[PDB]
């Protein structure tokens, strides 16, 4: 079987969650996926899975044990409010924002800089010219 143990439980009212260190004992196995940790920490601490965040998990040399950090928000909405974006995307709570690469965006920015005004009037002027 696999055991999970929470230690150093700190209550955090003004961010409305609980902090702790997760120790996962997994004999005869590689490790536990974060999703399974989230769902059962939800079961034990008795919160909805979405309010549960788990990260920073490292297995000890030789295997059989891992240690990470766990957060249990008082509500799903509170988790959505305070909790980092990239991790919500990890949990699917947020959708990945599609953006172009930094060089592309900077080129867009500079070329936008060289135009003045909306430019629609320039567009119609050149259209009439040609």
């Amino acid at each position: 079987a696999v055991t999970i143990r929470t230690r150093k439980v700190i209550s955090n009212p003004l961010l409305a969650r609980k902090q702790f260190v997760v120790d996962v004992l997994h004999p005869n196995r590689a490790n536990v996926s974060k999703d399974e940790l989230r769902e059962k920490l939800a079961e034990v601490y008795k919160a909805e899975k979405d309010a549960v965040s788990v990260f920073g998990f490292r297995t000890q040399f030789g295997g059989g044990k891992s240690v990470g950090f766990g957060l249990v928000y008082n509500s799903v909405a509170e988790a959505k409010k305070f909790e980092p974006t990239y991790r919500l995307v990890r949990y699917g709570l947020a959708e990945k924002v599609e953006k172009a690469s930094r060089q592309q965006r900077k080129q867009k920015k500079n070329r936008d800089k060289k135009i003045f005004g909306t430019g629609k009037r320039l567009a119609k002027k050149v259209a009439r010219r040609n």
Binding site: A1, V2, I4, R5, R7, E43, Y45
Partner: peptide
């Protein structure tokens, strides 16, 4: 104090 658990 924390809580303890086990599955499978």
């Amino acid at each position: 104090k924390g809580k303890n658990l086990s599955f499978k």
